Design an enzyme around this catalytic site. Structure first.
Site, short mmCIF file in Angstrom:
data_model
loop_
_atom_site.label_atom_id
_atom_site.label_comp_id
_atom_site.label_asym_id
_atom_site.label_seq_id
_atom_site.Cartn_x
_atom_site.Cartn_y
_atom_site.Cartn_z
N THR A 1 1.07 -1.40 0.18
CA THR A 1 0.20 -0.12 -0.84
C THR A 1 0.71 1.48 0.36
OG1 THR A 1 -1.78 -0.78 1.29
CG2 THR A 1 -2.19 1.19 1.37
N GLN A 2 0.45 1.69 -1.05
CA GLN A 2 1.48 3.32 -1.08
C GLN A 2 0.45 4.43 -1.09
OE1 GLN A 2 2.88 1.48 -4.70
NE2 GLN A 2 2.69 3.56 -5.53
N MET A 107 -2.26 -6.45 -2.57
CA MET A 107 -1.45 -4.92 -1.58
C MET A 107 -0.83 -4.21 -1.78
SD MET A 107 -4.60 -5.54 -0.06
CE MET A 107 -4.97 -4.04 1.09
#
Ligand code: SA1
Ligand code: SA1
Ligand code: SA1
Ligand code: SA1
Lengths: 233, 198, 196, 222, 222, 204, 212, 198, 196
Positions: A1-2, A107
């Protein structure tokens, strides 16, 4: 996740009787700072496909590298690389779609919205969308981000359903698209006045236009507007 | 929560209420009477938040007694319950609401019929043959739904309650230390001092 | 938002972009951030459109009643009324205001009221998201006692740069000239200031 | 919701779609978003229906009393000042977003108010979830010096953009034209491009289909 | 933070006839208040006379269908081209779904076909694999608007014999494919009127001993 | 948590030929627990009928409030209130509590005693008036009700027919809602008479 | 949901409701809440449908494998512990299941094992699982006798579910009955609660508070 | 929590454990035996988290039985307890710790003396004349601190426990459905089937 | 931090302030943000001092091994290695890096690697907190093919402005000149650039 950092705004497109058109401005925003102005967000792949990308620019550059490799790899031990076995737009798309969904499933997505425009070997038009969630869909017209709200309604007034495609010429289409780019420059706070446009016609091939500009804007009426209600001067 | 049960039979309303008062880790009392007589023919049982519970009951008692003196008349059960519902419905939207649930059992001397009213802290009121507050209904309603009859004698009502209390003492996790039972009929309110083994 | 006020030889000039946004959407591309609170006392509004409007409307009311009783108010007095409202209600307001006025005795004057409600009298002032980008430019190009043409030029260049870098700024550049001669409205379109 | 306002050479016209929704459910397929503040000052509302509605009637009521007291026709700027100071006071808690237009002794006007109390002026405007589809059309076809008929067309087209492209909008198009010298004309259902097709079957039940337990007559006469 | 899920709207319906079965679904694909496509097929022919649809989060629905079709392919490869009976496809899908029990395919899936006796059959699945053979099942956005209808018009619930004092239930005579298509169409035109995510088009896939057939009808585009 | 999903219940009103019908279930529960199967949600003041879904205590309070208000209205106006007027009274009464609303979903039904015209209307919890010509739904099974109505409904049905229609709409919608049912009652209304019928349904 | 199972002279009675809900929405009134592990073993399902359905069907496969390997019918104790231990491996993951494993073996006789996703495994005579459990327990506790007849036992179970179907909003639809004998289980039909309620009311005289 | 009590008298260790198993709103069983025999002269009682409780007990049982077979010898109570402490002390720092508390009562045939060990889920071990887990100690320790004597007969131990159980049944809020008592001495482990009224 | 790289006629110049802070405290007032990754390939570091150091140290190592095997690396190749490290580890790094190198065939080149790990080749680039204030100034004063003296002047003025407005910038101005002639180190003190 970013979280996206340097981003590209809308990517608009539509299909006409002989091909498809696709466009995107040349901006790479950094939050509210319109940081980079020479960003090309339209990636041609071969001469029958153009991939338009919006979202995180660092990921776009990564998708770019992936696309170049696809081309190299396809050439390997392929005596028909520039003929019957060259990359089709649908191949390019299915590949990207696959990657986008794998990345979201781990993710760690490629923070983009992508439109793949092109002409299949049998002349068919190809226009499909894929994004960071791996979601995909097709429509006579397709736009990402802001252009989804403002461009689609305009473009759909030209090609409302499938049967309108054969009745739409490159002229009408390129016009609709150029006007949409102006409207987006009017209401999208993360847009640039400069942009690139590309046409993929089953007869004239791929035409890639760089350094276009929104022209013929209406601002004169601004002078007649003063105050915010009761002020007279 | 505590046990608050009510059953309206042929000629009376019976209210059963747990005797335990638990504060945290200990059971401080096992003879608590969670009821207040509002008038000679009207009884109210209650359960809820620690202090609010009695303060509310006594506050209601005061008002009914005041009405009885002023008018030298006893308000009908229906009247006393509407008064109580309204008091709670006001409280529900105040700074600090009364967290109290009540059962009002009364004998209407004019209609010559017993009446049972259930009102929760929100001011939700309903009239029933039998009712309860908290989890109590969950264990007992299937027994009452089965054995209940409109023409039951007071004696049959006490037997049906006993059955309910036994089910409660079997499946409910807490020890509520038994119940105190009271009957309300044409002759007033009396307590069944013998339920510890009836 | 990009707004500024610059004092010069014959008085003072106000300038601003014409953009109001709600997120990335441009709700208004022809907004007028230059508001009149008196004949020769105007203000530049940034921050909350709703708050700055309400503030301005009240200052105008206060100065109207002031005039009815004590005559024309000094630019300093107008800035003081703004200040009072911004400081005393700092917890509920988001208003960056620049007050600019022309007095015959004092000539042009500029008072900047930033977020906390403090007041700062300066030769010129800039504010709004777009201002951050032109701090260096303005500090290097501002000069006291410039001519009307030079001042219009300074504002035009400064703002076009602010508009260039700030996505929160755009549309046209509006200006208001306040001198003994009167009140002049100026407007500059994209095709002009973008290629400066 | 899609609501727009468009000025024309001798007046102003406002229009709106007719869809009312609760989450994803369409509650009213033909609600009316065009309200009157005074005979010649009309409003188009977006946001919380109860609020746009309540606010239009409150200021409308006061505008009437002001008119009667001053022996003058109500002015748009007055309804605008009363609306914005009311909305401002409530810090956006009154979810009213309006496009207020009308003609009065001083000319023809077109404004917009947001829940927080800010107002804006323009020749063409739109608000609501359809806002962007409508605006796209307006930015594409507007021009100065529109005739009454052109303005109606433009405004009507702008709402269509919303009806078709916005899920928050749909059903019909309501319009209201306010011309400098005449009475304001309210055109309810000026366009009805979404008539439901004839059902495939009739679901009329044979009488006696429903099981009844008890029946009685209700007394209405006191 | 990144949300791996989204909602593409849409609604699907599956009804099992005595010797046929249908699986329908609108062709509208949405995101919030925007329409992504007015025509994006959602019900697929997976071979071996099995039709399937995984409604909800499109990326997940696509992966599932794609994964199941590939399952049918290998079933043939590994079991001498044996036909995959719908009951077997059902158990298979349950495992595909339960495999992601802790990061589920956010979809409501339904498959239709004929069982091993030639009788019509519908199976509806849970996002995590729970499944049941059913008569008819609507799934998706307007599911709550359609099921009540179907209980009434397909299983004649709450309907009794006129004159029997609700003592005799209306007999369960079974519908033909033509009558079922009517219910399906009415079900969607109704859903289209009240739900903002339903519209544009209705595509139906009919399964009989002769194979899979497709029918298409337009729906309101607002 | 949701005041509107604690007690459960539904109400539906429909217009027919020179008639109107309003119906409701009889359930009153406390979440999963059924508490009363006789909690009627329809009330009337003169010839005007009002159904109310939502938080039971508020349903009770509002009825008491409107009785109170329609009583004084009759005493001053010297006539019974009309559907259209009552609708405005309901709206303004709810809005008056804009920032501390009653958690209800009111529904008005009746026939104008002077014009004979049928009338139904719905309101959100803060008074927004929804004036439909066909039907109006409210309650924990409102989605189901919309589906039932949209399909089963057709204009100008006769009293006897509208009864069947509204009853089937209510019944089948309640059976898809955990919090609705436990009995139902339907009101068929005409200029001169009003019939009230209790329906037979599942009790689970 | 309401599910029960009790032991008695004639074996084991298993009764369940058939309602499926997601919030207030009634997803179904015809769901199966009993899994036929094999001809001699029954499993009840409460909590998560997928979790119960999946692992109980898997249990079936493990039992079969046992009988092939040991050429002998698996014990209820052993079958229940296979499920129990599997579930315990997932403790903390979020599995949601309340279940009764029922069988009649020569070695053990009638046997009920309660198994939930918390890892709890309890052998008992009477068990009720689900949001309607308390209602069923009330009816069961006061009419249960070890010497009940297979006919009366079946009815008690059916009646207990009925009580729950009536009071619990999350319970209802229909009743599914099962009788478990050493020679296997015997299905005893599907009884729609709708019709069953009125019938029971009239014949029994109970549910007097409901107007019929 | 459940009731886990232990008392070491002159020639034996006595363990008392509540019979109730409650899951939320209902008491699912009132005859649960919260104990496992680790070897002929060693008994372990336990209370804690739902599934962990038995899994741990049985896991320990398995290991001791395996040791008994391998060595054809019975580990001393002290030895079995150190093994158990270590198992818990490992678990306390693992991914998902065993939330179980235990009392280990055994008769050391070599020393000819009974021994009582208290070990909580953290691996905290202590040897005592009497002990408990949970809240149980709070109500009973003052009674044991008073009446306890090192030379008590098994009969005196059972009387002292009975007193403890009565105090528990009076002041503790929950109904733990009585206790099952077991004696461990030179002759093994036996259960006092008569405590429901001893 | 304020850092920039500018290509010109004879090559390219790097510049930076010399301030490292921990809150409002100046931990180092003579920091050297101009780091060498190869003889004629340097970088400007902003963001995390720890991260940028670790990144640079690794790039230098990578370019050393590259040289050992394939000879001198192109400025583009150095920027690619930086990019690889910044993009692939975007979640754990806070590094804004500008790469500047002198090639004989390519002359001067500038690549800017902002936070996300993207790469941008430009005539010149600015970065760090202090850069925001000089966007307008630089855009107005930059010219391609400037002389060494003009370029040093551009950097000196730009940075002094950035240092002026940004509390996160300060100390001295350091510069590194990269041309065919070699590598030159320049430093400018407060008393000089503050009064420009
Ligand atoms: C500018 O500060 C700005 C304006 O919208 C606002 C509008 C009218 C007068 C005050 C200034 N304020 C904002 O919140 C937006 C977003 C960023 O800055 C705006 C463009
Ligand atoms: C539009 O803004 C909209 C309308 O329901 C509402 C109805 C009457 C007057 C004001 C406008 N407002 C809403 O909240 C819904 C949801 C999205 O927009 C609506 C359709
Ligand atoms: C009951 O436990 C219940 C059922 O939906 C479910 C369905 C099939 C087999 C397992 C049981 N589980 C639930 O989550 C719902 C909500 C409350 O209980 C249900 C009705
Ligand atoms: C600049 O970005 C800055 C420097 O401390 C840092 C030090 C050495 C090389 C990289 C740049 N980074 C910071 O976090 C502080 C606070 C604001 O900017 C700094 C001065």
């Amino acid at each position: 996740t970013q979280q996206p950092i340097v981003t590209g705004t809308s990517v608009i497109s539509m299909k006409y009787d002989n091909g498809v058109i696709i466009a995107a401005d040349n901006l790479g925003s950094y939050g509210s700072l319109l940081r980079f102005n020479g960003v090309e967000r339209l990636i041609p792949v071969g001469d029958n496909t153009v991939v338009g990308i919006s979202g995180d620019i660092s990921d776009m550059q990564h998708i770019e590298r992936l696309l170049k490799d696809l081309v190299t790899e396809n050439a390997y031990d392929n005596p028909l690389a520039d003929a019957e076995e060259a990359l089709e737009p649908s191949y390019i798309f299915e590949y990207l779609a696959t990657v986008m969904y794998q990345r979201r499933s781990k993710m760690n997505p490629l923070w983009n919205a992508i439109i793949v425009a092109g002409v299949q070997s049998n002349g068919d038009q190809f226009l499909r969308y894929v994004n960071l969630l791996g979601v995909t869909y097709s429509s006579p017209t397709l736009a990402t981000g802001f252009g989804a709200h403002m461009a689609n309604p305009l473009l759909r007034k030209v090609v409302d359903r499938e049967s309108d495609i054969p009745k739409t010429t490159v002229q009408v289409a390129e016009e609709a698209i150029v006007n949409a780019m102006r409207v987006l420059y009017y209401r999208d706070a993360r847009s640039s006045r400069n942009f690139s446009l590309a046409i993929i016609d089953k007869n004239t091939g791929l035409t890639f236009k760089k350094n276009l500009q929104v022209e013929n804007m209406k601002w004169d009426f601004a002078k007649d507007i003063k105050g915010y209600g009761t002020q007279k001067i | 929560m505590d046990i608050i049960l009510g059953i309206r039979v042929q000629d009376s309303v019976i209210l059963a209420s747990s005797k335990a008062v638990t504060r945290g880790i200990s059971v401080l009392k096992d003879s608590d009477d969670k009821t207040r007589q509002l008038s000679p023919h009207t009884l109210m049982s209650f359960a809820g938040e620690a202090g609010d519970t009695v303060q509310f009951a006594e506050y209601i008692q005061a008002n009914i007694q005041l009405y009885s003196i002023r008018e030298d008349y006893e308000l009908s059960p229906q009247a006393v319950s509407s008064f109580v519902r309204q008091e709670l419905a006001k409280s529900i939207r105040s700074r600090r609401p009364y967290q109290v649930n009540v059962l009002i059992g009364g004998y209407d001397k004019k209609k010559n019929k017993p009446e049972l009213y259930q009102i929760d802290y929100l001011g939700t009121k309903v009239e029933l043959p039998y009712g309860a507050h908290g989890y109590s209904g969950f264990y007992t309603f299937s027994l009452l739904d089965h054995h209940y009859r409109p023409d039951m004698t007071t004696e049959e009502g006490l037997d049906l309650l006993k059955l309910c209390v036994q089910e409660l003492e079997k499946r409910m996790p807490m020890d509520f230390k038994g119940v105190i039972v009271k009957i309300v009929d044409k002759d007033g309110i009396r307590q069944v001092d013998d339920f510890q083994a009836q | 938002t990009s707004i500024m006020a610059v004092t010069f030889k014959d008085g003072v000039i106000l300038g601003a972009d014409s953009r109001t946004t709600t997120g990335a959407y441009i709700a208004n591309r022809v907004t007028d951030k230059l508001t009149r609170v008196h004949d020769k006392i105007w203000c530049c509004r940034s921050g909350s459109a709703a708050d700055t409007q309400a503030i301005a409307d009240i200052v105008q009311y206060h100065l109207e009643l002031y005039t009815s009783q004590y005559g024309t108010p000094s630019t300093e007095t107008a800035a003081s009324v703004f200040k009072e409202l911004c400081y005393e209600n700092k917890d509920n307001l988001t208003a960056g205001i620049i007050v600019a006025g022309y007095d015959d005795k004092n000539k042009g004057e500029v008072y900047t009221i930033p977020l906390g409600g403090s007041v700062h009298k300066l030769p010129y002032a800039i504010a709004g998201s777009g201002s951050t980008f032109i701090y260096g430019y303005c500090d290097k190009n501002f000069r006291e006692n410039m001519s009307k043409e030079e001042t219009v030029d300074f504002i035009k260049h400064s703002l076009s740069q602010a508009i260039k870098w700030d996505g929160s700024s755009g549309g046209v550049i509006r200006m208001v000239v306040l001198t003994a001669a009167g009140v002049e409205r100026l407007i500059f379109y994209p095709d002009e200031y973008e290629q400066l | 919701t899609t609501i727009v306002g468009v000025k024309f050479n001798n007046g102003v016209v406002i229009a709106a779609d007719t869809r009312s929704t609760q989450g994803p459910i369409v509650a009213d397929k033909n609600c009316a978003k065009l309200h009157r503040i005074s005979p010649k000052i009309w409003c188009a509302g977006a946001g919380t229906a109860a609020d746009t509605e309540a606010v239009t009637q409150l200021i409308g009521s006061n505008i009437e009393l002001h008119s009667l007291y001053t022996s003058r026709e109500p002015r748009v700027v007055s309804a605008l000042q009363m609306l914005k100071q009311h909305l401002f006071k409530y810090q956006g808690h009154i979810g009213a977003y309006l496009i207020v237009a009308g003609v009065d002794p001083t000319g023809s006007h077109l404004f917009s108010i947001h829940a927080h109390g800010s107002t804006d002026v323009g020749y063409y405007l739109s608000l609501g979830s359809g806002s962007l589809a409508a605006m796209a059309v307006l930015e594409s076809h507007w021009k100065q010096d529109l005739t009454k008929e052109e303005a109606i067309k433009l405004a009507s087209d702008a709402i269509q953009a919303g009806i078709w492209n916005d899920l928050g909008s749909g059903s019909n198009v309501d319009v209201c034209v306010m011309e400098i010298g005449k009475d304001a004309e309210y055109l309810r259902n000026y366009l009805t491009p979404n008539v439901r097709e004839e059902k495939q079957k009739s679901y009329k039940f044979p009488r006696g289909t429903t099981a009844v337990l008890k029946e009685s007559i209700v007394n209405i006469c006191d | 933070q990144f949300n791996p899920y989204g909602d593409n709207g849409g609604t699907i319906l599956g009804i099992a006839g005595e010797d046929f079965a249908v699986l329908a679904g609108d062709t509208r694909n949405i995101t919030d208040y925007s329409i992504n496509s007015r025509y994006e097929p959602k019900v697929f022919d997976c071979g071996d006379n099995i039709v399937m649809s995984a409604n909800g989060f499109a990326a997940d629905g696509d992966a599932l269908v794609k994964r199941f079709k590939n399952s049918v392919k290998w079933y043939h490869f590994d079991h001498n081209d044996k036909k995959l009976s719908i009951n077997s496809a059902a158990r298979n899908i349950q495992h595909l779904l339960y495999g992601k029990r802790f990061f589920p395919y956010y979809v409501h899936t339904i498959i239709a076909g004929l069982d091993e006796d030639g009788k019509g059959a519908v199976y509806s699945f849970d996002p995590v694999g729970s499944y049941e053979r059913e008569q008819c099942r609507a799934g998706g956005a307007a599911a709550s608007l359609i099921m009540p209808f179907l209980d009434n018009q397909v299983n004649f619930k709450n309907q009794y014999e006129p004159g029997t004092n609700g003592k005799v239930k209306k007999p369960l005579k079974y519908l033909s494919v033509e009558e079922v298509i009517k219910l399906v169409r009415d079900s969607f035109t109704s859903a289209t009127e009240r739900h903002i995510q339903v519209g544009d088009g209705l595509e139906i896939l009919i399964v009989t001993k002769d194979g899979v057939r497709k029918e298409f009808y337009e729906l309101k585009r607002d | 948590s949701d005041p509107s999903s604690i007690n459960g219940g539904i109400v539906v009103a429909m217009t027919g030929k020179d008639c109107v019908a309003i119906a409701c279930d009889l359930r009153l529960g406390s979440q999963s627990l059924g508490v009363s199967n006789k909690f009627e949600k329809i009330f009337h003041y003169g010839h005007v009928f009002l159904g109310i879904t939502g938080l039971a205590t508020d349903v009770t309070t509002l009825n008491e409030m409107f009785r109170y208000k329609t009583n004084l209205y009759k005493l001053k106006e010297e006539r019974a209130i009309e559907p259209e007027t009552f609708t405005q009274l309901v709206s303004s009464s709810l809005y008056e509590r804009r920032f501390g609303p009653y958690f209800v979903g009111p529904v008005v039904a009746g026939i104008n005693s002077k014009s004979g015209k049928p009338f139904i209307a719905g309101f959100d919890l803060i008074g927004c008036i929804d004036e439909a010509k066909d039907f109006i739904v409210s309650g924990t099974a409102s989605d189901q009700l919309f589906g039932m109505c949209e399909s089963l409904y057709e204009p100008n049905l006769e009293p006897e027919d509208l009864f069947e229609t509204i009853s089937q709409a209510l019944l089948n919608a309640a059976d898809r809602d955990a919090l609705s049912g436990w009995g139902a009652v339907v009101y068929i209304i005409k200029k001169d008479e009003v019939v009230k019928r209790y329906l037979k349904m599942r009790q689970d | 949901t309401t599910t029960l199972a009790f032991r008695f002279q004639g074996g084991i009675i298993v009764a369940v409701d058939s309602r499926a809900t997601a919030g207030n929405w009634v997803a179904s009134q015809t769901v199966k809440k009993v899994i036929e592990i094999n001809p001699f073993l029954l499993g009840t399902m409460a909590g998560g449908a997928a979790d119960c359905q999946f692992w109980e069907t898997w249990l079936g496969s493990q039992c079969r494998l046992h009988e092939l390997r040991e050429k002998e019918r698996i014990s209820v104790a052993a079958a229940s512990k296979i499920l129990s231990n599997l579930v315990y491996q997932y403790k903390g993951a979020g599995l949601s299941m309340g279940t009764m494993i029922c069988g009649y073996t020569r070695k053990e006789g009638p046997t009920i094992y309660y198994v939930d996703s918390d890892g709890t495994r309890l052998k008992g005579d009477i068990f009720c699982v689900g949001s309607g459990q308390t209602f069923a327990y009330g009816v069961l506790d006061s009419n249960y006798k070890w010497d009940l007849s297979v006919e009366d036992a079946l009815y008690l179970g059916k009646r207990s579910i009925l009580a729950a179907a009536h009071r619990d909003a999350y319970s209802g639809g229909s009743v599914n009955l099962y009788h478990v004998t050493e020679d296997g289980w015997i299905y005893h039909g599907n009884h729609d609660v709708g019709e069953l309620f009125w019938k029971v009311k009239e014949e029994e005289g109970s549910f007097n508070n409901v107007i019929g």
